[PDB]
């Protein structure tokens, strides 16, 4: 009965999210390749910088998207405006203009990502937190399904017809999402926030900050016009911030592992490797949702989101250790024979080893994801105040982007001449004379330290 009733609205929201994710992954799958192979052939550095700027704008727009959704507008209306801007920007690709289109697409996706999760989360808030947890599980499953569908269909229909349609496919998807969402609204009534006074909440926050400049906060605000709700929201946000601060290195390690696993698998369509992870997720989310959760319900072992994030961090560390061991074995084997292969239009030298040895580590990462990210989202919805859930989601996405940037900086920094772990990394391939195993071991050590710090912070937070 918990999932009955608004099932149609939940399915519509999941379909819209799937279409949005498919369009985004279609955009990001071969943007650099399309720009390089286009008649306006730029340099590799120029395309890389454009992609990095696009990703940074998408990461940065999420807090402002949540701010715009929370203030002077609703949630569904802000989603509609964001996806309209997304469609308008995406229409430019099949046709300075490129910069404007990238800006529009980035703003649209940043607002959509920041606003879709809180809306669907509050849509099922009628029942207990278990309904929200199941909704988040199916939300992540739909995201992965959309990723797989895009990364397959792009190549599936790219060969049949002209390549322009390859970029026209996401746009149509966006349009479809638009229509679906519109229809959903006609029967949504998913407890619309109707946020009008929430704008004042923002200025109240500033007033509280002024009260800081002019448990000190509680006693100071008791005398003034600072009714307990806003003070408790400020306290909750203050408690939340260190969690994200500790989670930033986790996102750094996550993105670095995502890049390095593909880079290593290249030496055993290039996007299919990434699909592997998603495929594993598509296999793991349902089974767990039907088996892992009930058993705890039988034993009363239901942990907090922080404990599940810690378990995910432990699985990440185990996967990093396994990847390091596999890289060491591959380096030991490769010092005797090499095999020349071609992927796309690039020649790579790979060791005489099967590709299935990547199955264990990937599997571990999958478990970590199904134990961590979703749980974090639940926390991102649970501890956040009811007034500014979208702002909290936007800040979380911004912190994830900052972690990704820190990971890229660390990857650049572990390539200095004094380090000596890699010298052919500047070249496209020939990672045979490199030391990626040491990089994996360093990532595992950093993950362990971050896990310990997060455990301490989680214990301190749960004590209060």
Swiss-Prot record:
Keywords: Endosome, Immunity, Innate immunity, Lysosome, Membrane, Peptide transport, Phosphoprotein, Protein transport, Symport, Transmembrane, Transmembrane helix, Transport
PROSITE patterns named in the record: PTR2_2
Superkingdom in the source lineage: Eukaryota
Catalyzed reactions per annotation: glycylglycylglycine(out) + n H(+)(out) = glycylglycylglycine(in) + n H(+)(in); N-acetyl-D-muramoyl-L-alanyl-D-isoglutamine(out) + n H(+)(out) = N-acetyl-D-muramoyl-L-alanyl-D-isoglutamine(in) + n H(+)(in); L-alanyl-gamma-D-glutamyl-meso-2,6-diaminopimelate(out) + n H(+)(out) = L-alanyl-gamma-D-glutamyl-meso-2,6-diaminopimelate(in) + n H(+)(in); carnosine(out) + n H(+)(out) = carnosine(in) + n H(+)(in)
Alphabetized CDD domains for the sequence: MFS_SLC15A3_4 (cd17348)
Regions that span the bilayer: 22-42, 49-69, 78-95, 99-119, 135-155, 163-183, 237-257, 269-287, 309-329, 363-383, 394-414, 439-459
PTM annotation (Phosphoserine): residues: 217
Quaternary structure annotation from Swiss-Prot or TrEMBL: Interacts with TASL; leading to TASL recruitment to endolysosome.
Its job: Proton-coupled amino-acid transporter that mediates the transmembrane transport of L-histidine and some di- and tripeptides from inside the lysosome to the cytosol, and plays a key role in innate immune response. Able to transport a variety of di- and tripeptides, including carnosine and some peptidoglycans. Transporter activity is pH-dependent and maximized in the acidic lysosomal environment.
Protein family according to the UniProt entry: Belongs to the major facilitator superfamily. Proton-dependent oligopeptide transporter (POT/PTR) (TC 2.A.17) family.
Protein name per Swiss-Prot or TrEMBL: Solute carrier family 15 member 4
Name of the coding gene: SLC15A4
